Design a protein around this ligand. Structure first.
Ligand SMILES: [Ca+2]
Ligand SMILES: [Ca+2]
Lengths: 119, 119
């Protein structure tokens, strides 16, 4: 029943993550930019978002703020590129659950969402 | 002491894999195409190669044949895109150790190389 939206500009990684959580029984969706994402959040209203903050043109902080407006029950976990202080701080402020840096420990990501979005 | 060369056209995934094996104590190298790879094999003579068979322009079977010519002690594990019969067959013939399809189980890949290239 749980839905997870994976936002990432890179097919390879995005597709790998998707599988990790499909394999877990989660209804997963995928987005490559903040526009698509915003769209899916609107349409599907996922429980959690795995949001890549490094997307060209993309202001991840802004999309994070919008998701919430759209759906205030959505929880987000941001993916940093080797964690950046100010983004991590604004996100905590925005309500993000945690942050994971890439390259990631898939197992740790896994463990993390299961804990945050128990099936 | 063990060296592993990761050949993959996609930075994201390639970089993630690299980390998995760096984290394991392996001296890792990276390539985005068969040319670079061939070069590194020549230069570094790695113990194992994780070879993405789906690289544009790239005949993975041919690069596999060349690696071996260059370095007959090199072992290869091919990454298929949802495993293809004839490629898997020629590779077995060429001496590949096994094949993994993407999206992969990183843990299983991990377990696999450790077993094939024990540290
Ligand atoms: Ca990105
Ligand atoms: Ca590829």
């Amino acid at each position: 029943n749980e839905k997870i939206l994976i936002v990432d500009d890179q097919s390879g990684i995005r597709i790998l993550l998707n599988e990790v959580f499909n394999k877990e029984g989660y209804q997963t969706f995928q987005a490559a930019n903040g526009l698509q994402a915003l769209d899916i959040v609107t349409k599907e209203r996922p429980d959690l978002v795995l949001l890549d903050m490094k997307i060209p043109g993309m202001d991840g902080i802004e999309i994070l703020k919008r998701m919430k407006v759209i759906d205030e029950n959505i929880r987000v976990i941001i993916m940093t590129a080797y964690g950046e202080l100010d983004m991590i701080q604004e996100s905590k402020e925005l309500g993000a659950l945690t942050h994971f840096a890439k390259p990631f420990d898939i197992d740790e990501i896994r463990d993390a969402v299961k804990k945050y979005l128990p099936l």
